[PDB]
Amino acid sequence: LITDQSREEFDILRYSTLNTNAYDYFGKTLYVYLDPAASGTGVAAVGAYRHQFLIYGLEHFFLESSEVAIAECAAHMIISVLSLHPYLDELRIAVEGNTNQAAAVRIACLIRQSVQSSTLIRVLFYHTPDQNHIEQPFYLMGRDKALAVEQFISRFNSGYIKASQELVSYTIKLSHDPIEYLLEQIQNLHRVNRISDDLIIAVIMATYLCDDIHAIRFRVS
């Protein structure tokens, strides 16, 4: 399914971002995605380097309002990633509103609040047309899922997704190695009972939406 060799490499080879002053080959766009949800919240923040993908942040979160914390957990990850990578100059963010578009709306709003208080930046959100035929800041996930998974798998096995040394994770880092933790969940992927899959799904997606195809669904919030 997913090759031991591809997994190993993912583990023992991470990109030493803080080693160079030559940024001329990395992205400048941080792309982030979050699965909200007994269950857990997944957050992944990725960017490009040459023709490859760099994971800069992972959160997986368990539980005053669910919604205020969820927002704050993610805003915290972004302001730290951004801090460590000054070549970044734009945030493209996608919030899965799949079980409750209502809540996810506020969560978008809240994240932007937090981030822009901290730091000066472009902040766009994944905007999809609602029921009154009107654009909102949530991702409704569905028929793409399959392509997205079958894409990562392949991208993964060929070594295109790489972690960074200085990857930020305030939820996972004090208990596990973000990356080994992630692997336990990649190890668990299947094509299409008790298997929290929220971290990996968040990764997969945050990697799929970076294309040109979706370059326009992101829009000033």
Residues of this chain that interact with a second copy (CB under 8 A) are 5, 8, 11-17, 19-20, 22, 25, 50, 165, 177, 179-180
Q: Is there a contact between 41 and 60 (Cβ–Cβ < 8 Å)?
A: yes
Smallest distance from a second copy to CB 15, Å: 5
- CA 188/CA 116 separation, integer angstroms: 36
User: Does the annotation mark 8 as catalytic?
Assistant: no
Active site residue: 64, 96, 130, 212, which one? Answer: 96
Q: Which tokens sit at 173?
A: 């880092």
* Residue 81: both structure tokens together: 């990633």
The token pair that represents 56 in the structure block? 């800069």
Please identify, using beta-carbon distances, which residue of 20 and 39 lies nearer to Mg ion: 20
Q: Is 41 exposed, middle or buried (0-12, 13-18, 19+ CB in 10 A)?
A: buried
Q: Which is nearer to a second copy, 153 or 182 (CB)?
A: 182
**Residue 179 beta carbon to a second copy: minimum distance, rounded to whole angstroms:** 7
How far from 34 is each of 7, 139, 198, CA to CA, in Å? Answer: 23, 10, 9
Radius of gyration of the chain (CA): 16
**19 or 132, CB closer to a second copy?**
19
Known catalytic membership, residue 67: no
Is 130 marked active-site? no
* Contacting Mg ion within 125-184 (CB under 5 A): 180
- Kindly tell me which residue out of 20, 39, 99, 165 binds Mg ion, with binding defined by CB under 5 A: 20
50 or 133: whose CB is closer to a second copy?
A: 50
Helix (H, G, I), strand (E, B) or coil at 47: strand
CA distance 90 to 76: 16
Work out what residue 12 binds among a second copy, Mg ion, Mn ion, none; the CB cut-off runs from 5 to 8 Å by kind.
Answer: a second copy
| DSSP letter (8 states) at residue 172 | T
From Mn ion, Mg ion, a second copy, none, interface partner of 35 (C-beta below 5 to 8 A by class) = Mn ion
**Active-site amino acid positions:** 35, 96, 198
